[PDB]
Symmetry: D2
Subunit: 498 residues, 4 copies
Amino acid sequence: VINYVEKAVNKLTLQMPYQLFIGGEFVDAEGSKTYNTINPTDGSVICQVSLAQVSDVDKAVAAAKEAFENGLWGKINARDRGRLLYRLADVMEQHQEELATIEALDAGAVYTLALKTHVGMSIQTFRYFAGWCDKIQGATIPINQARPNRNLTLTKKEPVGVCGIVIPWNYPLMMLSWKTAACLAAGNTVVIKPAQVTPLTALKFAELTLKAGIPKGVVNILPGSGSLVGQRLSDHPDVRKIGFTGSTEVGKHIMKSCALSNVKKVSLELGGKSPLIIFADCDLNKAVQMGMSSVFFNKGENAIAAGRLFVEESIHNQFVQKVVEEVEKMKIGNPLERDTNHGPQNHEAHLRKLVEYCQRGVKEGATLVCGGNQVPRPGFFFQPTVFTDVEDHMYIAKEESFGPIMIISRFADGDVDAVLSRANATEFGLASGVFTRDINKALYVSDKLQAGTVFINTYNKTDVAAPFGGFKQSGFGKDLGEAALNEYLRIKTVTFEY
Amino acid sequence: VINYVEKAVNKLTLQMPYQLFIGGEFVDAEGSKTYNTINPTDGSVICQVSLAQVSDVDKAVAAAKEAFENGLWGKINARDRGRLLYRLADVMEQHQEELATIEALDAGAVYTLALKTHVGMSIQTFRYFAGWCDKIQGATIPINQARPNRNLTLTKKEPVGVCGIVIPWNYPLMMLSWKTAACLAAGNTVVIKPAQVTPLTALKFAELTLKAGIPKGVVNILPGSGSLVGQRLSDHPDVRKIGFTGSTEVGKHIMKSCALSNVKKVSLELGGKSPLIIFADCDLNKAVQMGMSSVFFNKGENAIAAGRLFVEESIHNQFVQKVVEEVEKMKIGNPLERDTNHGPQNHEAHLRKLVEYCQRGVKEGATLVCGGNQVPRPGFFFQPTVFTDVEDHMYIAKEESFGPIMIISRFADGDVDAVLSRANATEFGLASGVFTRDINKALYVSDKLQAGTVFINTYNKTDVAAPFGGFKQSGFGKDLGEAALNEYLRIKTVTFEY
Amino acid sequence: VINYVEKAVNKLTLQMPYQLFIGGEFVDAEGSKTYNTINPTDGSVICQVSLAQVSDVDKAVAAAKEAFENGLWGKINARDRGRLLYRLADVMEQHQEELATIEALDAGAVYTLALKTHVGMSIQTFRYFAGWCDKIQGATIPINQARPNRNLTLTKKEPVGVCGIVIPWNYPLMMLSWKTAACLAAGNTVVIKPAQVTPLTALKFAELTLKAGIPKGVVNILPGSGSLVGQRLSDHPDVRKIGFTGSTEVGKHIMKSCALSNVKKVSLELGGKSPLIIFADCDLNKAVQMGMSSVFFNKGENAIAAGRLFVEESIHNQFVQKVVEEVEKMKIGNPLERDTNHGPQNHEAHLRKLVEYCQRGVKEGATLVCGGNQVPRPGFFFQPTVFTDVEDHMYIAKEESFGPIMIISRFADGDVDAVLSRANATEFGLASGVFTRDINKALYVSDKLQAGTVFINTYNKTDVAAPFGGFKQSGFGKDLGEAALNEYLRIKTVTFEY
Amino acid sequence: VINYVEKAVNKLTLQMPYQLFIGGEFVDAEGSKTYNTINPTDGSVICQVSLAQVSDVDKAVAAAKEAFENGLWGKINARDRGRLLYRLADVMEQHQEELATIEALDAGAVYTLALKTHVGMSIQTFRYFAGWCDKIQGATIPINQARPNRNLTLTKKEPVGVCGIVIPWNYPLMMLSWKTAACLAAGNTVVIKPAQVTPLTALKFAELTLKAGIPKGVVNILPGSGSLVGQRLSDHPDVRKIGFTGSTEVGKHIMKSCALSNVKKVSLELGGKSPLIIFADCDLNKAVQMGMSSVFFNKGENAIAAGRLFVEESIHNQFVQKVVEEVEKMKIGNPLERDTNHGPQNHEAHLRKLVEYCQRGVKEGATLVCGGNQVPRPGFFFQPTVFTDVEDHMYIAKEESFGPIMIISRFADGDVDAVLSRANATEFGLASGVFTRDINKALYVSDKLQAGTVFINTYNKTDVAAPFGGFKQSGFGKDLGEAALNEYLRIKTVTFEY
Ligand SMILES: NC(=O)C1=CN([C@@H]2O[C@H](COP(=O)(O)OP(=O)(O)OC[C@H]3O[C@@H](n4cnc5c(N)ncnc54)[C@H](OP(=O)(O)O)[C@@H]3O)[C@@H](O)[C@H]2O)C=CC1
């Protein structure tokens, strides 16, 4: 039997585990240390959660190692590994309302969105990658023959072994799922560190692995801080790969730590300052709707959020006019209320940063059209924000807000290369977008944009089959798609002479 | 006119450039600094070579960046890029005797071997990767449709941009060729740092890129030190990828340097301590020939050299007898003598390391069966060496010699898993081999060996089409094969709604 | 409400549809015509089954065409098509005992074997291909650019459209599943003709498509004759692809009919006379076990069954002795009885053919070591048979028995190429096998065998992920694996200029 | 020493072989039979050409078989096969002017076009496929393991063996090259039947295979009739694959002949009635240029020629006015003259057919806007022709002309689905095209068009890397791209247990 924090809310009875998940059981951290997880709708403590220590990390890694080297996960058929991951997805589907509610409490995710995206996409992720298990294939290669003898060369795709996954707080379950699904589908075992501020759906997910029959030690979950738990994972001599999603500066440190220990492999999904270029020949009403969504989706807590909108001179003023109209219709409120469409920010420290971000925007001369402030109510709500007259030298033109802040610049009618240059003048390169009805402009702009994803007449259209990752200082490696598997596999070349 | 060091040798008049190669021109380093490159056959100075400074690195990177962004290389068809790389191979083949002679002089490479391997495989590498240019393909992906609308998702494979390549001294031209061919085939431009002790074939190669019509600035070559030139490449804000081959310790530092600058991509080909397991049911005389080659090839200066031979008890002593008989037949001498089997070690400091390595093996209790010291003669020759009674705890059982030192341990008759455990008990993982006539042992042992390459009934059988790279602390990423391309390409996902 | 033939057998109540399945409903054939399906255990009539006429084929094709062009199947996401096929697999697994019992009745498949293979592999087939749906991907291709303009070239994989599947009687459900799973995963719709003598699992499968929610018209099943129903499918102007498994002579006629109508695509899985070469250095007892299995599995009604065994001279007599010892232990009986090893042949005409086959073998001078005759008991049982002293000119050396008849020839000790020549001297090339502990022989022999599958130290080891198809007159195209999809897809190239 | 027909023309000396090419030597046909090849510029006889008989086919097939089974071609490394084909491409380039001049003489190809396309693309084809040789790769597949044992499954890509290639006359050398390059790159040997009316570049190409060092027997060339030589290739028991390009009716017969002999593999590139849909939002001047090119390229003797132009109501008359203006500017004349941009039709029978075809268009009520007649000069020149008021039921709306005949229909403004239906109402499906600046219409139309190639804002843009083939009665299988290799390879599955 497992200890839960029980909570009657959203017409359900939530049963939330709150302990470390190690070697297939929920256990207290070393010394029974704990910390509070905060509900962002009202600032209250949801419950106490175990706080992993170094010795807990070592225990998690040991369990992962044993499960890989000697446990059932390392022995079963790829096909049957796949069956287990499908079953895991089914179990997650059976708990989708409960998971979405926990995500609503823990991260302020609007329930209807959490159900469709945070949770729904997590389910798709496990089903998608389950299908890959018995379709991961190596090669036979026609090398030169050592005459009078013959040669056969083949490759085998093998798991990398024990992995660490370190994720952020914006979509707690979904970021976990993206990376964990690829990791497990490739035959690895894993120690996962959720963002300290959002441990709850991870811990519930841990319980669901038990229900699905995932062998003990294959999935291990350690709520705790990056500087302690995350750091130890990156240092550990038995971890052979880190999968990381978070800020560029922590990414740099993680990669450094991978190097200095045992050259463990690393993938990095880092920040974004993603440009959206809106031409006069677009469908303007659709540009407003998709433009809205590109910034405000998931309260702007979205690595690929459009961080600059460049709007062609002749439609700029009309675009801003319509954006303001639509911004005014947004209902701000409790994520559990069905009419809510803008929930609170994830946690307090992030709310503070958003306040400062907008102060600086105003200080440096941008026009604040609306918002920019904490909403006066309990919790950590932030008013949807629109800036105009944003110039390329400005802080808010360079730096990622990760909040609901639309940052608008003009470009002259008929300029294409000039706006492209401005769009590309960033060390980020995670995503980008273009709205235009012109085929030639769409294709040309998408060649020239220096970003891992280019959206054309849409935005935020991610898919579990479509690889997702950055260029330049947005990192390297893919989540999602066939390409994701490559971060979690190694290639062995086997060459015979006969 | 290019300045040459001219040398009448080996029936040829070598014309050897000696300066930095930047933006299509041979130029002195800052302050006209130079250093000596040393002939390992007699310890004489071959000539002075420009010694790149930081400002020279910055110039080379600036030339590479301009060549990629605005030069011809970034505009031509993939197919036409292929034609240029094929033509480069042709030029290399037209100069193959000269390149092999230069390699004999600079690296102590035995001339017959240098023709066939150092130079011959370099030519194969360019031809092979030339064929890939117009066959690098992205995907179209059946994502979920945003009904009532439609979606098209495709991927585009793009170059990474400016690359730095840092290589070692054991096969100067060939290591350059492996990485550079893949790098250029993928459409990138490059700054190459050859090992300071072996700049000459790299500089001759630079001139050949001119004869081949490779556009100015696509290839830049900077002889100089790792800690100065190599460091600046890893730190440089406009370099987007480092391809590295060398020691594990420098590899760690390189990766750290990529992290701390701009999270540039990195691939690491690091040390080996590769195990060769020889069973009693093998063809013994063949095992002796291949066993010897697995150690002594290219005077042991070979990252995949078998660093331990595990020989089944019942054949051990006969195996050692035959090896000693064969070792006595090896002709040691000048790399230009056509009957030379064994040339000098690459440079003086390495010879001294090899003397110390062998003193240490004796001191810790291994049996010196033959060799173990510098051959008394001018230059830097080391005796082919055989150690027996080697035990798992010993320094020479753990550490990579990178010299012609056969390190033999028995294993028990009819044991398989126990020898595998010993073979795997290393943080290296670059290569390995197994000699056996038994199909079941061969397949099982190749599954279980923790190494990027497993040779079966052969050794050193690399091939331009067969991917080559390590596991664990031997690094990550592949040179050669289709797989090598992936270190030099990025994936852009382009998603339409219509 | 569906009409069933109800039968209480095997501790179950079977509910067997017996009508045509067209447009999602069970309906009588034109003029309510029927025929008898015969239980091979006792010769009794199981029930009457609808006998499809030309007008019924036309109705089924029309239903398939509507379902493809206007129905849901053609509109849903590839991912959701996948979900439906995974649901179909679950439904099949929920009914596995029932399906295996029906197959035991209809085909004489030993129940324990039918659970694991006839039905078990069918279930695996749908799960496997279900995973392919959203992972079938086109390409983006780096074509030459019409400078000063640009080009993008991509490929789209599209369904072929309406398909006909015509299958034999040896594994009724499994052969249907192999082809139908791939066909449907590629987004096609289908009309299936089971072998007239074995319609029952096909019809039950049809009902399971309803339970799984496969849209109406996607699957249509027509019990009936090849020369009427199969022929009309091949001739139909709206059918775009025929998938055929059966005899070489019918296969010729099918290909010819695809030609003369509308050059519909065709794939052909035809006969076999597969050689199994057993060397003296094999594991003898293992060779006996697998040798027997290679012939007797599924009462020899197995297209890849070893049709000749070549046994090295020095182990031949001992091999024959051991086979005879093991043959005597086989338990012949009712397929529903748990101790049964060897069930009845599929139908009477086939039994008659096997009797004649063995009469001819004795007549032409081969040594009948055992069997050769109908077992004295009700139904259509045939004694496991062993022939020795078979010479290459004999009829039984050339002709496919498709029954439990082991046909043994000797080869001289050491005579590798000579035995290969003998093994390849056939216009068939479906499968082949070699038993040897010698890696060099195994690799060499497998290069030289002219067959689509080579087994090494095993036999009948098929897998839903491993492609299966013949060379020469055994046909072309694959069932199973990624390769099977290509038969059911078309490639559209799309080339933009911008 | 080879016998040539020598001719001083176009500033060079042609040296044209005129005999059969068998087993690496030029030889007379049985009974020294010959026939005349006719120059379409003046109706004169170029020379006499050997006329292959049945026994010549058998000799060619036997040479091909021997070259495959025992000659060097079946023994050399894949890489070295690649070198030979790249050398063949070089030799072709060295003879580019001569080949293009022969093509002008024999087929009426305008010399400047022949140099760039007929010959230029042929050279690209061999270079492209040469690069594939050592990059053709099989798989290793994670099949279910027969516990407590292990399984390894790999696939080997092998040559099919002796192939027959039968080609049409519209681009003699280029059709030969497309198919032959893919065939040889895959390791096969081949017997080629050029169109009887166009043997000369094929025979010169045969001579170039000697200069390139292609082993004797690998390439064999048989000028002669389809009904005799082609038929025997389809029937031959030793031919294992036919590659065919030509009319639908002959394709049907070829496929039938493949079936009835030995189920040899077959690919079919058949007729087209390719629709080009021009929207009012296109760049009209560019649409006129590309539209004209879509019809008139290579005097309309082009399988992918737009056989039907649908032009949006509002631009229709202006489009027709502009086409007529541009047609008046075309220079009709000797293909060797540099100002010629419209050469003669390929042969006399085809000119007649075009004359009759246009009579029929006029008779059935289509408006003949210009052309329709033979040009009053020597040879077989036909006027660039434009029809308007073409109705869907008309013969000329349904039948492929294969000549320079633009066939125009209107469609209503804003119709999209209606025009698509009309464009898709054909049993052909080889190519298609759409001109529009609207991204949404372009993507949607290319989804809906039922053809193997869709051009968007261009036409005739084929590329050696882009697969080319038809849907429906336009056939199946690809020429060009990676996909083309699949017609010329077989997959062998090899499964070990250990
Ligand atoms: N899809 C594609 O890639 C292409 C298709 N084509 C198509 O070809 C047609 C125009 O050429 P056309 O001359 O009419 O084509 P045909 O089908 O009449 O001839 C093509 C080739 O087939 C040969 N042939 C004829 N009968 C037989 C037979 N019984 N067995 C074997 N071979 C035979 C011909 O020989 P012979 O010399 O005696 O006539 C010729 O070499 C058009 O429909 C066009 O669309 C053309 C080019 C490319």
